[PDB]
Design an enzyme around this catalytic site. Structure first.
Site, short mmCIF file in Angstrom:
data_model
loop_
_atom_site.label_atom_id
_atom_site.label_comp_id
_atom_site.label_asym_id
_atom_site.label_seq_id
_atom_site.Cartn_x
_atom_site.Cartn_y
_atom_site.Cartn_z
N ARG A 186 -18.53 -3.05 9.41
CA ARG A 186 -17.24 -3.71 9.61
C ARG A 186 -17.12 -4.90 8.68
O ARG A 186 -16.04 -5.15 8.11
CB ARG A 186 -17.09 -4.17 11.07
N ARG A 239 -2.81 6.27 21.59
CA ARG A 239 -3.95 7.14 21.83
C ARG A 239 -4.37 7.09 23.29
O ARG A 239 -4.72 8.11 23.90
CB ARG A 239 -5.12 6.70 20.95
N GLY A 265 0.80 -1.22 0.00
CA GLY A 265 0.00 0.00 0.00
C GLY A 265 0.84 1.27 0.00
O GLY A 265 0.43 2.32 0.53
N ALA A 321 1.70 3.59 -2.00
CA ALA A 321 1.31 4.85 -2.63
C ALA A 321 0.12 5.54 -1.96
O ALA A 321 -0.30 6.61 -2.40
CB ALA A 321 1.05 4.64 -4.12
N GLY A 322 -0.41 4.95 -0.89
CA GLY A 322 -1.54 5.53 -0.17
C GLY A 322 -1.15 6.47 0.96
O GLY A 322 0.02 6.79 1.15
N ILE A 346 -1.17 6.30 4.45
CA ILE A 346 -0.27 5.77 5.45
C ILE A 346 1.12 5.61 4.85
O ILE A 346 2.10 6.04 5.45
CB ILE A 346 -0.79 4.44 6.04
N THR A 401 -1.15 -3.71 9.29
CA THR A 401 -1.81 -2.46 9.62
C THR A 401 -3.18 -2.36 8.96
O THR A 401 -4.13 -1.83 9.55
CB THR A 401 -0.94 -1.26 9.21
N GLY A 402 -3.29 -2.88 7.74
CA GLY A 402 -4.54 -2.79 6.99
C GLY A 402 -5.73 -3.39 7.71
O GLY A 402 -5.63 -4.47 8.33
N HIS A 433 -8.71 -4.49 17.31
CA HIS A 433 -8.59 -3.10 16.86
C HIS A 433 -9.96 -2.70 16.33
O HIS A 433 -10.23 -2.79 15.14
CB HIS A 433 -7.52 -2.96 15.76
N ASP A 458 -3.97 2.40 18.97
CA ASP A 458 -4.88 2.39 20.13
C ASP A 458 -4.12 2.67 21.43
O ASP A 458 -4.53 3.49 22.25
CB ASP A 458 -5.57 1.01 20.23
#
Ligand SMILES: NC(=O)C1=CN([C@@H]2O[C@H](COP(=O)(O)OP(=O)(O)OC[C@H]3O[C@@H](n4cnc5c(N)ncnc54)[C@H](O)[C@@H]3O)[C@@H](O)[C@H]2O)C=CC1
Ligand SMILES: NC(=O)C1=CN([C@@H]2O[C@H](COP(=O)(O)OP(=O)(O)OC[C@H]3O[C@@H](n4cnc5c(N)ncnc54)[C@H](O)[C@@H]3O)[C@@H](O)[C@H]2O)C=CC1
Lengths: 326, 327
Positions: A96, A160, A9, A11-12, A14, A127-128, A185, A157
């Site tokens: 979800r 945070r 991923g 090029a996104g 994150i 992570t995805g 998560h 999480d």
């Protein structure tokens, strides 16, 4: 010798935060070079070339080289760390289950590829989203890689939660230790103040307010992703990349003594988390290996919350089993 | 160490989003020097800024001693030792680069005055927002009580881009490349100088041995790199611009290696025939928050031509902002 690091991923959002942290030395420090192997899907390759141009334009001394591609078996070849970020983000019309269905096949395929060509010493961070279940899928589809090599990211999480506690107590984040996120998560995650410490004192004892924990702290942590979406117009990016960095770094380099971190890893039944689930535990790390923190006493409140989250995880496992992803 | 108070303007923008998290995780001062972030935006962007701070908070950065946000430069700049002026309109959406001079200049008149009134005595000021040199000129001029050497415009992105191109061309690693110089304006007239640069202890121009490549490919490629990035990603070079902003400030404060130098657009004392008072890119060494222009370089004919074209452009921009009453 450069660490071979695959990032999917790339090029996104994150990715656009993460790759520069990685290449600048945020993962292994100033003396350890990094080879980046970047995976995307076809219509993003052009954009990925662009990202690589920017990488080149940073003149990073530690960036030994960059390879890009769309085939996981090329990119995962001999990698020692695989960061699986590539997957669609949570859409506004999505339940979800919509996202789980949308992204799971990615991890079936990538788990198989890692199994085929990754280095023997590979660690795999997912992570995805949905993080836990996607990690379960990848793990299950890589039977020749030790199951302990797979971890879903709950470190965002965790961080945070540290931030919220630090704000509540007027303490610096460096005063906060032994924070725990249990389970999924998702909005069922359980942040545990009862084993955390603020400046050497039991966090639950310091904040002295059960109603605050239940009514403000837990749901503010649990729904923080949603809050970011509302405030920013898209899910967390730079902070997700930073959390990915923290988790991978701690995994490879080790946790501070007198502290632990949150990692979603495969359960052996510890703390009554059903065997086989990818579930967030308190862990210490050394030599690339994690250990679930032992001897913790789980109070009744905490038990109720933890069970709620693991029930959600079991439902997700059943769902991907039905979809034939595992 | 006591937290370094660092102001960043344009904090809710693209470069800001690529800049703040690296700053707060130690890219500026290293692993043991905390920083206090002070973030400036204009009113319509404050909401977005809140979102950004939410994410910063969510990183639980041990080095981030605190964060203040606001839209009043007199408040945000209060006591800062480093001001990174990134806030300014970028090209696009009805504006070409030449339009930025008049679009953005007044920001720097105002921020100059603000810095003059409230910044720490030891403040260093790096201007990223375009046109960078002329914006720095404006800021500096409107801060007469701050030493003129405290102001610098960013040519470090051009510098890093040129290093990238050279390394690719020569098959060298970036660690092999020393003494790159960008002369003049951060613009299309910039002159990347290979004649004084090194590829692992060898003269870079001689290593390449191809004047046609220098003139027809290397220079325009470095000059048009921003557009290339946009054409490829569909979005501007925020991450590499942020990275260059960090590099320049870091080297400014912490010093350059003994075997190297970097590019910084700083006020000219007439050195190298660059008209005095222009903010113009020079090869510089740095130590303890101070820069020194590299002396004794022999300027060949071709180099002289290119440098003079760039400083001529800088003189025209100075004239323009003078006519606009920005200085
Ligand atoms: N676990 C956590 O703490 C967090 C997880 N996430 C999740 O991370 C994922 C990525 O988020 P963003 O970067 O914002 O999304 P994005 O859409 O900006 O980027 C995703 C990228 O993945 C690529 N991709 C899609 N399928 C792929 C495949 N099979 N192989 C390689 N690349 C592929 C896409 O082309 C795209 O560029 C999302 O699922 C998001 O929900 C996001 C924030 C925090
Ligand atoms: N010197 C260099 O090498 C480079 C310079 N730039 C320049 O940097 C500037 C910023 O670029 P981007 O982040 O891409 O643009 P952007 O539009 O994403 O962000 C600019 C931000 O500055 C804010 N801003 C405007 N006036 C302000 C003021 N008085 N105080 C505080 N904030 C203010 C805007 O609200 C916006 O959030 C542009 O002028 C661009 O041309 C960009 C790339 C490289």
């Amino acid at each position: 010798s450069p660490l071979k690091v695959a990032v999917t991923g790339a090029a996104g959002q994150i990715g656009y935060s993460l790759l520069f942290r990685l290449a600048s030395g945020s993962l292994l420090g100033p003396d350890r070079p990094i080879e980046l192997r970047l995976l995307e899907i076809e219509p993003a390759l052009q954009a990925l070339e662009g990202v690589v141009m920017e990488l080149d334009d940073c003149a990073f001394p530690l960036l030994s080289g960059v390879e890009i591609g769309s085939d996981p078996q090329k990119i995962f070849d001999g990698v020692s760390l695989a960061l699986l970020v590539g997957a669609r983000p949570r859409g506004a019309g999505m339940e979800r289950s919509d996202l789980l269905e949308a992204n799971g096949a990615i991890f079936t395929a990538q788990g198989k590829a890692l199994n085929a060509v990754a280095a023997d010493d590979v660690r795999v961070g997912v992570t995805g989203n949905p993080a836990n279940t996607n990690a379960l899928i990848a793990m299950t589809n890589a039977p020749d890689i030790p199951r302990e090599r797979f971890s879903a990211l709950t470190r965002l999480d965790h961080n945070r939660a540290i931030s919220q506690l630090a704000a509540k107590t007027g303490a610096a984040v460096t005063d906060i230790k032994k924070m725990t996120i249990w389970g999924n998560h998702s909005a069922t995650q359980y942040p545990d103040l009862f084993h955390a410490e603020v400046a050497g004192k039991n966090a639950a004892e310091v904040v002295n307010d059960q109603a605050w924990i239940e009514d403000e702290f837990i749901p503010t942590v649990a729904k923080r992703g949603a809050a970011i979406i509302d405030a920013r117009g898209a899910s967390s990016a730079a902070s997700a990349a930073s959390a990915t960095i923290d988790a991978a770094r701690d995994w490879l380099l080790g946790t501070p003594a007198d502290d632990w971190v949150s990692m979603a890893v495969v359960s052996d039944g510890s703390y009554g988390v059903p065997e086989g689930l990818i579930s967030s535990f308190p862990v210490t790390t050394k030599g690339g290996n994690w250990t679930i923190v032992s001897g913790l006493e789980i109070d009744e409140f905490s038990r109720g919350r933890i069970d709620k989250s693991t029930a959600e995880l079991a439902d997700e496992r059943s769902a991907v089993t039905e979809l034939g992803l595992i």
